[PDB]
Amino acid sequence: GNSFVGLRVVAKWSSNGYFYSGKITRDVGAGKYKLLFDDGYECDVLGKDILLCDPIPLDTEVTALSEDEYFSAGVVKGHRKESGELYYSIEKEGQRKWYKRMAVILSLEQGNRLREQYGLGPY
Amino acid sequence: SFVGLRVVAKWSSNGYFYSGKITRDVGAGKYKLLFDDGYECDVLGKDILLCDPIPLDTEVTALSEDEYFSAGVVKGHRKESGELYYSIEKEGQRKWYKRMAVILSLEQGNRLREQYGLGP
Ligand SMILES: CN1CCN(S(=O)(=O)c2ccc(C(N)=O)cc2)CC1
Ligand SMILES: CN1CCN(S(=O)(=O)c2ccc(C(N)=O)cc2)CC1
């Protein structure tokens, strides 16, 4: 009687191939699931294109997308909880900065490095 | 003053101009912008275009759920229930986009500064 509904994931947006933070809201059939993204958008995503990352693991190559940093590549070096929110410490140049969960995304090539271990397809 | 005017204004992290409204004159040549995507910040007059609408024949960029930064040319405008749509020609087709879905790259927006830039 298990369901993926309410699991926090990082799921592919079809138009650009980047993986964004969201939650599963329904098993919709055809191995697709309804995704509510943190940025407020909803669509159906294939199980194979959903990463069960919560959080994205340490040492992972990621991309920062915040108000001040537009698609800046970096490496996850830390996780922090603050008032029920997850933050990532992302090392770029030789400097570490904190980013909210919503602000960390994966390029297609970055997400493919996690798919074998974290991808929902096999499950 | 320029308060309440619909504009196209530069987002500093990527150089793209996005649709919004001037909500306050903040002095030192800066304006508070409410962007149609719900973000607010302060923007210099030099980075604000008084386009409403963006003129016919302008090269623009479409950004929708299905089309991720796809360049084309404005060939039409229309009103549907009080909302503006742009007709963008690209790859042999014209399609209608809501105002919020039409943005300008720095190069596309730079071209419009002399005629439309709040400036100075
Ligand atoms: C006026 N707009 C311009 C764009 N910016 S942003 O900070 O670069 C951004 C924010 C959100 C998303 C997203 N939903 O994927 C993409 C980009 C917000 C303010
Ligand atoms: C999960 N997200 C991934 C990004 N997509 S989007 O459709 O490409 C988009 C939407 C809005 C803005 C923006 N505010 O500038 C930027 C990009 C929405 C759904």
Tokens of A56: 């994205």
Q: Return the HEC string of B10-29.
A: ECCCCCCEEEEEEEEEEECC
Ligand 1 pocket test target in A39, A99, A107 with most atoms within 8 Å of CB: A39
B37 to chain A, any CB pair closer than 8 A? The answer is no
Q: Is A6 exposed, middle or buried (0-12, 13-18, 19+ CB in 10 A)?
A: exposed
Calpha distance A22→A42 (Å, rounded): 9
Calpha distance A69→B19 (Å, rounded): 20
- Which atom of ligand 2 sits closest to the CA of residue B64? 7
Cβ <8 Å between A70 and B41: no
**Helix or strand run (H / E) with residue B115:** helix B113-116
Say if residue A57 is preceded by a cis peptide, omega within 30 of 0: no
A93-116 burial, b at 16+ Cβ within 10 Å, e below that, comes to: eeeebebebbbbbbbeebbeebbe
Calpha distance A114→A119 (Å, rounded): 7
Cβ <8 Å between B68 and A43: no
**B88, B102 contact by CB (below 8 A):** yes
Cβ <8 Å between A41 and B14: no
- Which atom of ligand 2 sits closest to the CA of residue B35? 14
Calpha distance A59→A35 (Å, rounded): 26
Give the type of residue at A45.
V
Domain stops at, among B37, B54, B71: B54
Q: Is the dihedral of CA B23, B26, B27, B28 positive or negative?
A: negative
Size of interface A-B (CB pairs under 8 A): 18
| A26 and A38 together in one domain | yes
Q: Is B30 exposed, middle or buried (0-12, 13-18, 19+ CB in 10 A)?
A: middle
Tokens of B89: 């020609």
DSSP state of A106: B
How determined?
Answer: X-ray
CA angle B10, A15, B35 (to 5 degrees): 25
**B11, B61 contact by CB (below 8 A):** no
Quote the number of domains for chain B.
Answer: 2
What is the span of the domain harbouring residue A48? 1-56
**Helix or strand run (H / E) with residue B65:** none
User: Residue B95, SS3?
Assistant: strand
Cβ <8 Å between A70 and B39: no
Calpha distance A65→A42 (Å, rounded): 19
Strands (E), chain A: 8-12, 19-29, 32-37, 42-46, 50-51, 61-65, 70-82, 85-92, 95-100, 104-105
Calpha distance A68→A65 (Å, rounded): 8
| B67 and B97 together in one domain | yes
B36 to chain A, any CB pair closer than 8 A? The answer is no
Give the type of residue at A87.
Y
Calpha distance A13→B81 (Å, rounded): 30
Calpha distance B2→A19 (Å, rounded): 39
Calpha distance B72→A19 (Å, rounded): 27
| B49 and B62 together in one domain | no
CA distance A38 to chain B (A): 14
CA B112 – ligand 1 centroid, Å: 22
Tokens of A36: 């509510």
| B68 and B82 together in one domain | yes
Q: Which of B114, B112, B101, B108 lies closest to B19 in space, CA to CA?
A: B101
Question: Which residue is it, tokens 């204004």?
Answer: B9
List CB contacts of B52: < 8 A, sequence separation 6 or more.
B5, B6, B7
| B67 and B15 together in one domain | no
